[PDB]
Paper text:
The most prominent regulator of p53 is the Ub ligase (E3) MDM2, which binds to the transactivation domain of p53 through its N-terminal p53-binding domain, thereby inhibiting p53’s transcriptional activity. Furthermore, MDM2 catalyzes ubiquitination of p53, where monoubiquitination promotes nuclear export of p53 and polyubiquitination leads to proteasomal degradation. ATM phosphorylates MDM2 on six residues (S386, S395, S407, T419, S425, and S429) that are close to the C-terminal RING domain and far from the domains associated with p53 binding. Here, we show that S429 phosphorylation selectively enhances MDM2 homodimer E3 activity, but has no effect on MDM2-MDMX heterodimer E3 activity.
We showed that the S429E substitution enhanced the activity and UbcH5B–Ub binding affinity compared to WT, suggesting that the pS429-mediated activity enhancement is conserved. We then purified cat MDM2-422–C-pS429 using the translational insertion of O-phosphoserine system, confirmed the phosphorylation status by Western blot, and assembled the complex with UbcH5B–Ub. Diffracting crystals were obtained from crystallization conditions similar to those employed for the human MDM2R-UbcH5B–Ub complex and used to determine the structure to 1.83 Å. The asymmetric unit contains one MDM2 homodimer bound to two UbcH5B–Ub molecules arranged in configuration similar to the one in the structure of the human MDM2-UbcH5B–Ub complex (r.m.s. deviation of 1.06 Å for all Cα atoms). For both MDM2 protomers, electron density is visible for residues 428–C. Because both S429 and pS429 were evident in our protein preparation, we reasoned that the abundance of pS429 could influence its occupancy. Electron density was observed for all atoms of pS429 at a level of 1.0σ in the calculated polder map. Like in human MDM2, cat MDM2 residues 432–436 adopt a 310-helical turn and F430 and P431 are stabilized by hydrophobic interactions involving I435, P437, P445, and F490 from the second MDM2 protomer. Thus, neither the sequence discrepancies nor phosphorylation of S429 introduced structural rearrangements. In the cat MDM2 structure, the phosphate moiety of pS429 contacts Ub by forming hydrogen bonds directly with the ε-amino group of K33 and indirectly with the backbone amide of T14 via a water molecule. Superimposition of the MDM2-MDMX-UbcH5B–Ub complex structure onto the MDM2-pS429-UbcH5B–Ub complex structure shows that S429 of MDM2 in the heterodimer is displaced by ~10 Å (distance between the Cα atoms) as compared to pS429 of MDM2 in the homodimer. Collectively, these results show that pS429 stabilizes the donor Ub in the closed conformation to enhance MDM2 activity.
Author numbering:
A (entry chain C), B (entry chain F): 0 to 76
C (entry chain D), D (entry chain A): 428 to 491
E (entry chain B), F (entry chain E): 2 to 147
Write the structure that this text describes.
Amino acid sequence: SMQIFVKTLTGKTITLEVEPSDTIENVKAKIQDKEGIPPDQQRLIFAGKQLEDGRTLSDYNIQKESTLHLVLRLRGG
Amino acid sequence: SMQIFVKTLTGKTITLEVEPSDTIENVKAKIQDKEGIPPDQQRLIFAGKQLEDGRTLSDYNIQKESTLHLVLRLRGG
Amino acid sequence: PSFPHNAIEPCVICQTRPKNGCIVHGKTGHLMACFTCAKKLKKRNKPCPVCRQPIQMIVLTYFP
Amino acid sequence: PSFPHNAIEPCVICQTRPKNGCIVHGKTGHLMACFTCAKKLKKRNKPCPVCRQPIQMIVLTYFP
Amino acid sequence: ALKRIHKELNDLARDPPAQCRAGPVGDDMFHWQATIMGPNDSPYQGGVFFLTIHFPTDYPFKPPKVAFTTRIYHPNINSNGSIKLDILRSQWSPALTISKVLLSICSLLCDPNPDDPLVPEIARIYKTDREKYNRIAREWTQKYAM
Amino acid sequence: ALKRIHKELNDLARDPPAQCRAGPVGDDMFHWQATIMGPNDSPYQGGVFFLTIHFPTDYPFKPPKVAFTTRIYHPNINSNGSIKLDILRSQWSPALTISKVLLSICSLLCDPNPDDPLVPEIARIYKTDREKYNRIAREWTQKYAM
Ligand SMILES: [Zn+2]
Ligand SMILES: [Zn+2]
Ligand SMILES: [Zn+2]
Ligand SMILES: [Zn+2]
C-alpha cells in the first residue's frame, strides 16, 4: 500500500512496504528480516515517542514516506 | 619498485607492489595477505606457463604493469 | 584502505542473490556467494571455492 | 533482490578502514566495523554494537 | 575518537533529529552542549533543555558523559541533571551516536520508568496522579526551561 | 546453471582471452566448442586445438566435461581426448570458469605429470628423452593442429 523509511542504528536508511493497520510488532519482524536485529533490541521512535508493539502505524499518524528512527532497547532507572 | 596486476579466480583484478627479484613464493604470500588464499592452492600463469615457487618475476620477463593470471593449484594424472 | 566495490555484485554461483553467505574458516572468511549456495557447499562437505580451506560454518551476513 | 550499497562505506567506529571485521553470533553476522576495531570490541568484552548478541568470533572477511 | 566525533558533528549539521541539536562548546571537540526541545503534547512542550556532553578519550568504545544543565521534573533525572539510563552505562554501544542518544533521551521524557526510579517521590506521583505529575512538570518547564 | 553459463558467455564475448575462445554449438547452451592456441615455446606452438565442453545440469557445483577433439601428444591426455586433471574431477571449484579451465589446461601442456600418467608410454619417453618427446609432440602439432 505505502512505503515508510527506517533510519537504522548506523544511519543506514531502509524502505519497508506496509499497511497503516500493520502492528509495530510486524514492522520490527520486517526489520529483523532485513537487518538481523532481534525485535526485543529494537526501540522505534516517531515524533519523539517510542512505538509500542501492540499498536499500529495509523495509531501514530505514520503516513506515506514517514521516517521511523531505530535506536537500541533502553531502560531508564 | 613496480606495480603488477593479478586477475584472481573470480576475474577481480588486484594490484601488487613487487621487485623483479621477488620469488614467486613471496608474490603468493602477498596474494594471501590481500585475498586470504594459501600459497599452496595458488597457481600463477603469465604466458600459458605456470610460475614456479623458487624462481623470480625477472626469470619470466614480468615487467611494470604485467598481468599474472591466478587459477587454483592443479595436477595432471 | 581498500574498499570492497565488488560486494554489491551478485553471488558468483547463481548470479542472482546478494553476497550474504560468508564462508568461514578459522579467523578468515570469503564472501562471494549467497547464503543458499553457500549452505549447499557446506551440506555436501565441499571446501571454500576460492581458497579450498574446509568450511567451518556459513554465516548469513548483514551490512547494518 | 537488493545488494549492500553501504558495504564500501568505512568502519562506523574508526571512520577510516574497510568493513572487513565480521561480528559472528549463531548463524548470523553484522559487518560494519574493520577487523582492528572488531578485535578491540571482543578484547574489551563488548557484545555486537548493532544487535547486542555476544561476539562468538571476529572473521577477517575478504570479497573475492 | 576525534575523526568519529567530527563525523557525528557533520551528521548533526546535515540531518539532526527533529527536537535535538548538539555541537562543541568552544575550541574543545570533546566538550559539547546539546538542546532537546520539549516533545509536542508532553508537559515539557515550549521548554528548551540544555545538556553537557563530555566524550572520553577512547570514545566510542566508552559512552559519553551526558547530564541536563536545565532543571526538569522526571523520575529518571535528578535536580543535579544526572540521567539514570542504561545506554549511558553498561548497555552503551559504539554504534550509538550523540544524535541517537539525544533521540533516546527525548523518548525517555515521553515514557518514564517509575518502577526503578532515580527520584522515588516523582515516581510515586507519576504512578498515582498523572495529571498532578503533568501539572508539576508543566510548572517546572515554565519556571526553568523558558 | 543456465544463468551462470550465460554470464560466462557474456564475459567471453565482452573481454575475449588472447589464446582461448569458447561458445555454444548452435542452440544448446550446455554444449560448447573451445579453441586453445599452442603455448609459445612449447612443442604445441602454432597449433590450434579444438575441445568439446558439456556443462552438467547442476553446473557450477559439478565440473564441465572437457575433452580434446584435436589429437595431442601428452602424458595426461589420451588419444580419445580425455584430460586426466584434478580440477576436472575431485579438485573442481564452482569459482573456476571455462576461461580459467582453458588457461589451466594450457598450463598443463607446458607442465606435464609423467609420474601418475594417463598414457604410460608417453610418460616413459618424457622422463628418458625430453628432446624425443618434444620432436613427437611437434610432429603431432604439425599433423593434427595446423
Ligand atoms: Zn547464489
Ligand atoms: Zn576461503
Ligand atoms: Zn575500524
Ligand atoms: Zn550483531
